[PDB]
Design a protein around this ligand. Structure first.
Ligand SMILES: NC(=O)C1=CN([C@@H]2O[C@H](COP(=O)(O)OP(=O)(O)OC[C@H]3O[C@@H](n4cnc5c(N)ncnc54)[C@H](OP(=O)(O)O)[C@@H]3O)[C@@H](O)[C@H]2O)C=CC1
Ligand SMILES: CCCCCCCCCCCC(=O)OC[C@H](COP(=O)(O)OCC[N+](C)(C)C)OC(=O)CCCCCCCCCCC
Lengths: 368, 78
């Protein structure tokens, strides 16, 4: 956020351009930069595009969904946000997105596969194509966002493709490409917290045992802003994670009390809060819905990843290398699960869980 | 006649809101229907136990009375 995201009013890109900034940093100001955010209509793109457009950075947002892009225009002043209809199977549209940008941010990536795109097409084929198209267009900075457990030799088809995608981005764009490895991100409408906030979660006895180091999505969006506007971060890999380690079983049980579903001794068990299932059934059901359901459900690869915990690459850089302190999930967990609290609505008295109260609740959850 | 129209509406909404409570209630309902249909006799034997312990005339008690009269009457002729 801040009031002006730059250390100076003059910035010479590594491509040779000199970009001046005007204004004090409001909506009417400009930074002189043109950025392209691939995957801007997604969960993280809306955070990133909003932070760039609010300070006057011209953002090119290539879209495939016409309805999802409309809310992005509100973030910036007139002419700041620009849309290009595109497809990763179309090369002319990809070049048009990066033709004028000085920064290219790649947020395109899926944990699923569909009738049209496999995990290899998106996490590798798209990332490689975008990196090469960026280089031929003279883009000074490339930022590629992989996952937290990226590994070219992983048993998970998502972790493997994310790890290989890191390699191909550097092999095309060159050694100066920056790589970000966010942990599971929590925010409003967060894919990480949405599965924990769902009631009828089938096979949670297997799925919810994975441990992670969740990180605030606003900080990940803030960190990417720091990286793009500081050329000392080129060629670097950043592992953005929170200080504390949680298992999805803990958060699932901590959320239950905040939602007050446990007010009744019978209701959570009757409503389907716990849905134990043998892993072969979880495999078959995930496999079956992969060719019957039209919406991306819990697939086979996510079942495998439920066993693999998050491993922090120690050779990579952290939030402290960017001069930022990670946020604590304890200080943000309530306000992001607040919409899901059942009665609330100033009935008698709200139970606002402070940061101290969340940690007290965590011990009670872990007490048998 | 209104339960015939409402029953599909109530049953599906009951499973949506409380799938475990509905499955347990519906599962027990089907089990007793299998007891009656397939002549498992579980509900009948419980009924025969309740009558015996509470002093009612059971089915066996009424048949024993007939057998006592039958033996009494035959000797009265022989
Ligand atoms: N907890 C998290 O969210 C985590 C995120 N990541 C990675 O961060 C990145 C941001 O994802 P996030 O915003 O959180 O959630 P999303 O699932 O919405 O990210 C996917 C984005 O990339 C686009 N995308 C996916 N496939 C295609 C495709 N074939 N063609 C064009 N666009 C495609 C999507 O476009 P559209 O919106 O139109 O569908 C969307 O904008 C992802 O790459 C993810 O792998 C990794 C670790 C943790
Ligand atoms: C009633 C018919 C509904 C069938 C839905 C369907 O077939 O859709 C399912 C699949 C998958 O394709 P998807 O939805 O893009 O996969 C993404 C969703 N996942 C992750 C759950 C797999 O589709 C096909 O096999 C394509 C042919 C369908 C043509 C229409 C019939």
């Amino acid at each position: 956020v801040s009031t002006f995201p730059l250390k100076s009013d003059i910035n010479i890109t590594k491509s040779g351009k000199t970009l001046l900034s005007v204004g004090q940093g409001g909506r009417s100001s400009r930074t002189g930069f043109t950025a392209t955010v691939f995957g801007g209509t997604g969960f993280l793109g809306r955070v990133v595009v909003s932070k760039l457009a609010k300070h006057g950075t011209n953002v090119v947002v290539p879209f495939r969904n016409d309805r999802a892009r409309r809310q992005l225009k509100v973030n910036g002043d007139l002419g700041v946000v620009n849309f290009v209809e595109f497809d990763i199977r179309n090369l002319k549209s990809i070049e048009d997105s990066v033709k004028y940008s000085d920064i290219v941010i790649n947020l395109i990536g899926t944990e699923h596969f569909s009738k049209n795109f496999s995990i290899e097409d998106v996490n590798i084929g798209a990332a490689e194509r975008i990196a090469k198209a960026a280089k031929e267009a003279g883009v000074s900075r490339l930022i590629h966002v992989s996952s937290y457990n990226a590994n070219p030799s992983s048993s998970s088809d998502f972790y493997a493709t994310k790890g290989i995608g890191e390699q191909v981005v550097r092999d095309n764009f060159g050694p100066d490409a920056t790589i970000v490895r966010p942990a599971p991100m929590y925010f409003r409408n967060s894919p990480f917290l949405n599965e924990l906030l769902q009631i009828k979660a089938l096979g949670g006895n297997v799925i919810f045992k994975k441990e992670v180091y969740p990180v605030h999505a606003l900080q990940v969006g803030e960190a990417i802003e720091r990286i793009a506007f500081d050329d000392a971060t080129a060629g670097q890999t950043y592992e953005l994670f929170g200080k504390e380690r949680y298992s999805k079983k803990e958060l699932r049980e901590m959320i239950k009390h905040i939602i007050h579903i446990g007010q009744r001794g019978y209701y959570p068990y009757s409503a389907g809060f716990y849905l134990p299932a043998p892993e072969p059934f979880l495999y078959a059901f995930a496999l079956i819905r992969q060719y019957i359901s039209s919406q991306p459900r819990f697939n086979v690869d996510q079942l495998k990843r439920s066993h693999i915990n998050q491993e922090i690459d120690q050779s990579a850089k952290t939030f402290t290398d960017l001069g930022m302190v990670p946020d604590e999930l304890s200080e943000y967990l309530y306000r992001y699960v607040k919409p899901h609290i059942s009665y609330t609505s100033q009935t008698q008295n709200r139970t606002v869980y402070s940061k101290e109260d969340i940690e007290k609740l965590r011990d009670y959850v872990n007490t048998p | 006649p209104y339960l015939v129209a409402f029953r599909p509406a109530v049953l599906v909404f009951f499973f949506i809101r409380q799938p475990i409570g509905a499955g347990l209630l519906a599962g027990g309902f089907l089990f007793w229907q299998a007891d009656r249909h397939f002549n498992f006799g579980i509900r009948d034997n419980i009924h025969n136990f309740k009558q015996t312990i509470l002093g009612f005339p059971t089915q066996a008690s009424k048949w024993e009375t007939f057998k006592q009269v039958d033996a009494q009457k035959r000797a009265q002729l022989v």
